[PDB]
Design a protein around this nucleic acid. Structure first.
Ligand SMILES: [Cl-]
Ligand SMILES: [Zn+2]
Ligand SMILES: [Zn+2]
Ligand SMILES: [Zn+2]
Length: 116
DNA sequence: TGCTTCCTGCCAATAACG
DNA sequence: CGTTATTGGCAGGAAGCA
């Protein structure tokens, strides 16, 4: 499934197939589905299948049109981080990865996923 | 060259377990 | 039914793309 590389006490897990390296073994296993397709994640709204559960989730939010990311400076909402970020940078000349929280991520309500 | 999707360290929520 | 194992959400940078 994988092998290990250790440099300066640091442990990395190497994918047998593509030789990508991971700090986290769980990352390796998650990534490896791409090669093996042991598990499948079918979009419940269309024919598409995904090698990662989170890819399907992001895809399914596109079908529902829920806009979970809201700019706190003007109230506009966006379907993902990327649209929200580029809005805030270009319209508000600010960075949401900065020290201030410039946005809110709402709970997913248009489908059923894990709640924080 | 701006959408669009992908990626992975981290770890909370969920599941399996015994 | 607590304890241990797994799943997958998330940020935000990278990669892909027409
Ligand atoms: Cl919404
Ligand atoms: Zn690989
Ligand atoms: Zn779909
Ligand atoms: Zn705004």
């Amino acid at each position: 499934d994988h092998y290990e590389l250790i440099v300066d006490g640091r442990v990395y897990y190497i994918c047998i197939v593509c030789k990508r390296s991971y700090v986290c073994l769980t990352s390796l296993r998650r990534h490896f589905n791409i090669h093996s397709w042991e598990k499948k994640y079918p979009c419940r709204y269309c024919e598409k299948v995904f090698p990662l559960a989170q890819y399907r989730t992001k895809h399914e939010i596109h079908h529902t049109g829920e806009r979970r990311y809201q700019c706190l400076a003007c109230g506009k909402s966006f379907i993902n981080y990327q649209f929200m970020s580029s809005h805030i940078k270009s319209v508000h000349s600010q960075d949401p990865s900065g020290d201030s929280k410039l946005y809110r991520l709402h709970p997913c309500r248009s489908l059923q996923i894990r709640q924080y």
